[PDB]
Structure 1
Amino acid sequence: APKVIVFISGSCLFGAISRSLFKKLPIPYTVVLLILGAILGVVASNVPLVEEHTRDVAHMDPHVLLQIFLPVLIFESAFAMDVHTFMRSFSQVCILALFGLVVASVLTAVLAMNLFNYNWNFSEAMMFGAIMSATDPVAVVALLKDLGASKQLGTIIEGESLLNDGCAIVIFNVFMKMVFFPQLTSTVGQNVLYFLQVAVAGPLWGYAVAKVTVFFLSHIFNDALVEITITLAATYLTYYIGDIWLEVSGVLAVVVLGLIVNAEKTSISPEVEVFLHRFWEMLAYLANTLIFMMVGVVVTQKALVAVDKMDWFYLIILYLAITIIAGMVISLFSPILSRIGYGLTWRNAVIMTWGGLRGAVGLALALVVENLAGNDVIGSKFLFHTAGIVVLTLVINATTIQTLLRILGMSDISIPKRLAMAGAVRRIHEGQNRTLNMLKSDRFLADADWDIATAACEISDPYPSPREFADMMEEARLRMLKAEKISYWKQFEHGMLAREALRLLVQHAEVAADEKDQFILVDDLKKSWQIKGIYPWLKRKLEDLISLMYKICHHMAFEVTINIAIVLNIVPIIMEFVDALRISNYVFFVIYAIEAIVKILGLGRHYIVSHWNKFDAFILVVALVKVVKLFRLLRGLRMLRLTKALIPKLILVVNGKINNQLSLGYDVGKGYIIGEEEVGKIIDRMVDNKKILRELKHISETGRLQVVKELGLLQREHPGIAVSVKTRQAIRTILNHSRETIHELQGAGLLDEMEAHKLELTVEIKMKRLMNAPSSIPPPPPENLLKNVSWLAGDMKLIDFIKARASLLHFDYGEVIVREGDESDGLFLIVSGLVKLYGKVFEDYLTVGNVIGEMGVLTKKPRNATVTCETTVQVYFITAEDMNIAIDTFTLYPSLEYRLWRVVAIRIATPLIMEQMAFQGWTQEKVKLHLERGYLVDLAESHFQFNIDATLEDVILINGTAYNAHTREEIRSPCLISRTVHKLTFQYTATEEPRLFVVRNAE
């Protein structure tokens, strides 16, 4: 009976000890595992009891390593990494990784032939080179994450190393079959078929299983166990079907699964994500520690009795050569691949060519070779050289990478840490001092040991002239970039931005920051919503043209019955090409009679269908009838009916792809617009030069106008996808705000924990259902647009009155609707097309669902902005006389005048509160939500005098000329009343009736 408990338990304990005790040291903890295994190996070589307890795990079957350890170690790497940045340039990175591994393997094999004195063939040398061409970027990515070189460079090298490991395993298997099992006699055509089976069919199987898994996972709500078990069983079944068919070369399939399931994380609950990540991390950790222990013991016991001085000399030469060729491949390949957008600097190339640590994949392959070799010296040489190279890398490179980085670019933390991390630690210290001073004046903690608290609560920092004009210009540019980054992050924390859009925006900000003089250029951002114009649009266009029983027999299972008949009939169809013939013939005749009477009924359909009717008639003609062997399969061509119902599914999937691109484009554009709008208000009081601030305002306005025009045209091009994405945005905003309300209720004590958990559960169910919505919502008719206006919704009589007196107007390109200075003819409502509103110095673009001329119909003022049609525009026109009639008709508390004045009041009051800036962090959304709570009260009830309390947070003058009760303080609209005022009255003037907007505090 084999003894394994002590070895596994001791490996776990020693891994914990080495992991905890080598946290601070720069050396990796795995070399400690290697030396511990070496000591255990020499002890077992001396002591027989330790040998008995060690021999059953130290010398295992090679299929344990090939079938259990390597799939886990590769799947954890594939599953752990983020893919949304790596899968943008997936094909090119795949090509780069494959080419690099192939060339490095060939140079290592040539070195193994000419330099080494062992009589080694090309197959043995190529397996040798494939072993020593598998790297590990863990140190490089760890030291590049915190240094802030790029978040788009660690993912690239991570994915490249993952593909490197996969192809290294594949070629190792290909050459191991030739070396150790030479009885096989596959030909050139068989080799080509095997290459097609490995490099194409495997990833396709993994992709299909992954797609089915996400499809079934998206329909499970509030069940963590079902999702976890389904995901794990799908992983095992993918591995098993790949393993029994492609042997160890069928790892690529599971790799693909690990990527695809990682990409579609929205169908997986976050608790399921964290559980699966920790699960696979623990499995890979156990495999890693076991591999290092067993290679240590088996390299001390066996491979250290057949070594000479020439072996050590060859190990040193090979260590030099692998570094030389690792530099050579990146020198000859990476500068050509400048299309990545992450062009190599002098520091980055040397960092990623020096931190090429070796890992446990090559050690496992060397273990497999040593097990398969037997008593031959080839396994001993393989294990000795692989272990020596791993040791040399893990010492020298892993300890000297930081020193090399300091030599290259001083390893300096730069500004992000120089200043930011200083602010936080200074204000954290001040808050802690304030809390401690509050605690010292308590009544119950007055006897606490304050030395202990003070010492154990503080934290530590982890880390005129043209020249003057250029200096303030650079300072203002850096300040604007910093403020834009703050705005993007604040938009993220409120749930108004997705993670990918925020990452794109901050990547553009960081790219523009380190340049000498470059702001956020629209051309870099334009590659977020322009990606629709590829083959998906053409494919959707091509499929658009292709597409008593049609209504009475119509149901959710009308054609599904025929589809079920096809699915039931494929099984007797498919057995002919792969006794029981009589029953199959009888059911064939029954189904043929059924479809014959179906076609007889369809003869009354007036032959409307052109393709499907002809194909069904041909099918019936074939079914009604050595040519017998041919006719046995000729009747089996009855799959012409599946492609009739498959066209909508392909249309749906191309709609999903277009929507997935358009959502990211819209998020990027909206975030940029909001960031510029906030930064223009922020930088107004932080610049001490009129020319500099004028230039900054000009460039910001130009960029914002270009972005908004492009977004409007993108909406115009395809309405269904735009309506779908905007609806999803609105629903996400509402759900996020309701979740915030739930959390605020829970914090105030008014909600128990279980009640809050139930409400949060309902909110998450609604979010998961929203994330699987239709990807193309049809645009609404203009009547729905007229009925859904903010000041018209809810009143059926008013809706009928306005709809009866409204007219439709159509305008072409270049027409002018209304010029400046003219009297207000009426009120517009854009229902189709973009339009440009320009006047006095300002210019904006209005799109569908927008209203023009509310101020003109309210205050009877002349127009002040010319409106020109950018496209063919359809508008709704309401005459001003009808608007006056409707105003004088409705006299309820939700008055037409009241709502009409409230809308323009909020619209004119938001910029004043934004420009005020008596605080910080007052975003446009939270300013708008603060102004929404406020209301205006007519002065007729209060005898034209208002008494000011301090319960108001802000008071704004939206109309007329103010007159306070002290010295008749006179102010002009629109203006934010000065903080130091008193109670104000008003005089009834028939020419102008002033009105004001007052906002209370939060209850």
Structure 2
Amino acid sequence: QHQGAVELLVFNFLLILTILTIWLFKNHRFRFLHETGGAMVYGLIMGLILRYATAPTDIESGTVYDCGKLAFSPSTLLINITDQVYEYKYKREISQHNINPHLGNAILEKMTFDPEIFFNVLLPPIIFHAGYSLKKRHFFQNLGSILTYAFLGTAISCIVIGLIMYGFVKAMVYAGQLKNGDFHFTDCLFFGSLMSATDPVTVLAIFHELHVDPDLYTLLFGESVLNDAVAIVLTYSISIYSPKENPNAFDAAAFFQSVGNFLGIFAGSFAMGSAYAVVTALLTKFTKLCEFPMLETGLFFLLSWSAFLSAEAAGLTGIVAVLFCGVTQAHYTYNNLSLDSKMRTKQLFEFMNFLAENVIFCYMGLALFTFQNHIFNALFILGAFLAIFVARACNIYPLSFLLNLGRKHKIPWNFQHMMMFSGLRGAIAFALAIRDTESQPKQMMFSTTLLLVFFTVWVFGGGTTPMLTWLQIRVGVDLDKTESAWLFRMWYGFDHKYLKPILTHSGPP
């Protein structure tokens, strides 16, 4: 053995060093760096010192066998050797036999992770923690604004990024860097959808530490929570798009079915999450598990995991379903659990979220582990930077003005610049980029996204405090109907009229 133990120990040591450095920085109050940035820089240092440590070594090349009557590559295969049948499993495709002697040199440790690990065990805890951690104060008078942002602006930014990337691809074809025809507008739309999820975790941490006005913090948190799921589902829908004939056509009568599939997946995920939440709320309400905190906590965790697994198995997107289940749980079941169970669940979920985000950023800081990197064509990177900048610019101001037209007597002026400055890219974009491999445009997009994240997270973590001071943003503020489209008040009345007396308000807490 002694294969995964070494890499896991290295990851643990890097996490310990990151925690120690964060404690040292916070002791001197230097700031200018977050735990995510520390983890990423430590991962970069580890990769740099591992790449150039034992590069001169032997060359290992795998043997080639001429397997006759083999026109397909099944996932599972049975090979009969010495009158004994052995099972072989297909894992990954490596089509770099030409550079195989170079790959053998400086092999060191691959330290690679399966792309589904980030989607099955790392992201869902973070999504559930984000959904459950609702202040339950405010976030409702501006809920419509958050929804309008996270819906319209994400699509607008995706379209703008796709158009600008298509234009830059045309310019490159004019320059003739490589072959013309490989890139397509579908790839541009995929890249735009991928570069639409924002997770300003450092910005949110700074806002919480400095006690900024809760309105801007709630708006940013809601946007970051919703746009991640919106971008994930949009990326899945774009990946579904496949015309029957004339590939990469325009208006091939498949837009309507793609939109229908998107709406159906979103509605199914929301319905499944709500159904699981109401089922567990009713189960807790009828039972008297308030005297057994361990049993009710375990039941809650198992029910949440079962909801996630049911969402994944049904063919829908598990992230959005988990988010909706978590927010509905925090809305309803939080008033029925015992006092100790609430604290236990909150501590467990926040610890899991912290560990998951630390591991995610530590692995993201590892940039030298991938041999199939395509970091070149600086014009492409510059075009991507301009596209994301202009997409962020057009996301806020037009929607902000449109909301200010029918504004609810609360003008959010001068806060748009802070939203412009908060343009971090979270783990969703990295996971989506790393999901697809062995493709030149995919590798180029992954490298560009990684470089953009490395630049933007560091620069915005460095400049958040000067930006806050320059805009005269109020800090240190203690947290302690008709205007709402006439629909939010009706929903609140309906909830307090029928749902509340049956789902809660009775039973020992």
Do both proteins adopt the same fold according to a TM-score greater than 0.5, normalized to the shorter chain? yes
Match of 1:307 among 363, 375, 388: 375
Match of 2:341 among 272, 293, 305: 272
Q: Distance in 2 between matches of 1:80 and 1:536?
A: 20
Question: Structure 2 matches for 1:810-829, cutoff 5 A?
Answer: none
State the partner residue of 1:887.
Answer: none
Q: For residues 517-558 of structure 1, give each alpha carbon's deviation from its aligned partner in whole angstroms, at most 9, with x where no partner exists.
A: xxxxxxx9x999x99984898x9xxxxxxxxxxxxxxxxxxx
CA contact (8 A) 1:72 1:283 kept: yes
Match of 1:368 among 432, 435, 445: 435
Q: For residues 796-853 of structure 1, give each alpha carbon's deviation from its aligned partner in whole angstroms, at most 9, with x where no partner exists.
A: xxxxxxxxxxxxxxxxxxxxxxxxxxxxxxxxxxxxxxxxxxxxxxxxxxxxxxxxxx
Instruction: Tell me which amino acid in the other structure corresponds to 2:262.
Output: F
> What's the CA shift for 1:316?
3.8
CA contact (8 A) 2:290 2:337 kept: no
Q: Distance in 2 between matches of 1:79 and 1:412?
A: 27
Aligned to 1:297, the other structure's residue is in SS state: coil
> What's the CA shift for 1:204?
0.7
Match of 2:357 among 276, 288, 299: 288
Q: Distance in 1 between matches of 2:208 and 2:492?
A: 36
Q: Distance in 2 between matches of 1:158 and 1:197?
A: 26
Question: Structure 2 matches for 1:354-433, cutoff 5 A?
Answer: 354-369=421-436, 373-374=437-438, 376-409=439-472
Say if 2:412 is the partner of 1:344: yes
> What's the CA shift for 1:198?
0.6
Q: Distance in 2 between matches of 1:659 and 1:331?
A: 43
Instruction: Tell me which amino acid in the other structure corresponds to 2:109.
Output: T
Q: 1:222 to 1:322 in 2, by over 3 A?
A: same
Q: Distance in 2 between matches of 1:209 and 1:298?
A: 40
> What's the CA shift for 1:386?
0.8
Q: 1:136 to 1:335 in 2, by over 3 A?
A: same
State the partner residue of 1:21.
Answer: 21
> What's the CA shift for 1:18?
1.4
Match of 1:160 among 200, 217, 223: 223
CA contact (8 A) 1:78 1:255 kept: yes
Say if 2:244 is the partner of 1:169: no
Question: Structure 2 matches for 1:778-857, cutoff 5 A?
Answer: none
Question: Structure 2 matches for 1:634-783, cutoff 5 A?
Answer: 655-656=497-498, 771-772=505-506
Q: Distance in 2 between matches of 1:86 and 1:137?
A: 18
Q: Distance in 1 between matches of 2:449 and 2:422?
A: 17
State the partner residue of 1:134.
Answer: 197
> What's the CA shift for 1:139?
3.4
State the partner residue of 1:678.
Answer: none
> What's the CA shift for 1:108?
1.0
Q: 1:301 to 1:255 in 2, by over 3 A?
A: closer
Q: 1:3 to 1:197 in 2, by over 3 A?
A: farther
State the partner residue of 2:165.
Answer: 112
Q: For residues 365-421 of structure 1, give each alpha carbon's deviation from its aligned partner in whole angstroms, at most 9, with x where no partner exists.
A: 22112xxx21x3223212211111111111211111211222221x5757x69xxxx
> What's the CA shift for 1:152?
3.2
Aligned to 1:107, the other structure's residue is in SS state: helix
Q: Distance in 2 between matches of 1:2 and 1:341?
A: 64
Say if 2:321 is the partner of 1:253: yes
Instruction: Tell me which amino acid in the other structure corresponds to 2:166.
Output: M
Q: Distance in 2 between matches of 1:97 and 1:2?
A: 46
Q: For residues 587-644 of structure 1, give each alpha carbon's deviation from its aligned partner in whole angstroms, at most 9, with x where no partner exists.
A: xxxxxxxxxxxxxxxxxxxxxxxxxxxxxxxxxxxxxxxxxxxxxxxxxxxxxxxxxx
Match of 1:69 among 122, 137, 141: 122
Instruction: Tell me which amino acid in the other structure corresponds to 1:161.
Output: S
Q: Distance in 1 between matches of 2:408 and 2:453?
A: 31
Aligned to 1:62, the other structure's residue is in SS state: coil
State the partner residue of 1:9.
Answer: 9
> What's the CA shift for 1:340?
5.0
CA contact (8 A) 1:69 1:287 kept: yes
CA contact (8 A) 1:65 1:368 kept: no
Match of 1:34 among 40, 45, 48: 40
Q: Distance in 2 between matches of 1:211 and 1:196?
A: 22
CA contact (8 A) 1:6 1:53 kept: no
Q: Distance in 2 between matches of 1:298 and 1:536?
A: 49
State the partner residue of 1:208.
Answer: 275
Q: For residues 27-80 of structure 1, give each alpha carbon's deviation from its aligned partner in whole angstroms, at most 9, with x where no partner exists.
A: 22333333333344355545389977732x42x332222333232232222122
Q: Distance in 2 between matches of 1:12 and 1:535?
A: 48
CA contact (8 A) 2:194 2:433 kept: yes
Q: Distance in 1 between matches of 2:162 and 2:120?
A: 26
Question: Structure 2 matches for 1:219-238, cutoff 5 A?
Answer: 219=287, 220-238=289-307
State the partner residue of 1:199.
Answer: 266
> What's the CA shift for 1:146?
5.0
CA contact (8 A) 2:297 2:341 kept: yes
Q: 1:9 to 1:282 in 2, by over 3 A?
A: farther
State the partner residue of 2:61.
Answer: none
Q: Distance in 2 between matches of 1:770 and 1:33?
A: 43
Q: Distance in 1 between matches of 2:151 and 2:315?
A: 19
Aligned to 1:74, the other structure's residue is in SS state: helix
Instruction: Tell me which amino acid in the other structure corresponds to 1:655.
Output: K
Q: Distance in 1 between matches of 2:9 and 2:492?
A: 55
Bigger relative contact order, structure 1 or 2, given CA contacts below 8 A and separation 6+? Answer: 2
Q: 1:133 to 1:297 in 2, by over 3 A?
A: same
CA contact (8 A) 1:104 1:133 kept: yes
> What's the CA shift for 1:279?
1.9
Aligned to 1:345, the other structure's residue is in SS state: coil
Instruction: Tell me which amino acid in the other structure corresponds to 1:6.
Output: V
CA contact (8 A) 1:44 1:51 kept: no
CA contact (8 A) 1:11 1:289 kept: no
Instruction: Tell me which amino acid in the other structure corresponds to 1:387.
Output: L
CA contact (8 A) 2:213 2:475 kept: no
Q: 1:535 to 1:253 in 2, by over 3 A?
A: closer
Question: Structure 2 matches for 1:868-907, cutoff 5 A?
Answer: none
Structure 2: stretches of 5+ with no match in the other structure: 58-104, 173-177
> What's the CA shift for 1:129?
1.3
> What's the CA shift for 1:158?
0.7
Match of 1:324 among 390, 394, 400: 390
Q: Distance in 2 between matches of 1:341 and 1:268?
A: 37
CA contact (8 A) 1:315 1:385 kept: yes
Q: For residues 723-778 of structure 1, give each alpha carbon's deviation from its aligned partner in whole angstroms, at most 9, with x where no partner exists.
A: xxxxxxxxxxxxxxxxxxxxxxxxxxxxxxxxxxxxxxxxxxxxxx994179xxxx
State the partner residue of 1:103.
Answer: 156
CA contact (8 A) 2:48 2:368 kept: no
CA contact (8 A) 1:239 1:254 kept: yes
> What's the CA shift for 1:192?
5.3
CA contact (8 A) 2:168 2:383 kept: no
Aligned to 1:54, the other structure's residue is in SS state: coil
Q: Distance in 1 between matches of 2:341 and 2:239?
A: 39
> What's the CA shift for 1:208?
0.9
Instruction: Tell me which amino acid in the other structure corresponds to 2:312.
Output: D
RMSD: 3.8
CA contact (8 A) 1:8 1:290 kept: no
State the partner residue of 1:964.
Answer: none
Structure 1: stretches of 5+ with no match in the other structure: 418-502, 507-523, 540-652, 661-768, 775-1003
Identity %: 19
CA contact (8 A) 2:240 2:258 kept: no
Q: 1:147 to 1:378 in 2, by over 3 A?
A: same
Aligned to 2:402, the other structure's residue is in SS state: coil
Q: 1:51 to 1:256 in 2, by over 3 A?
A: farther
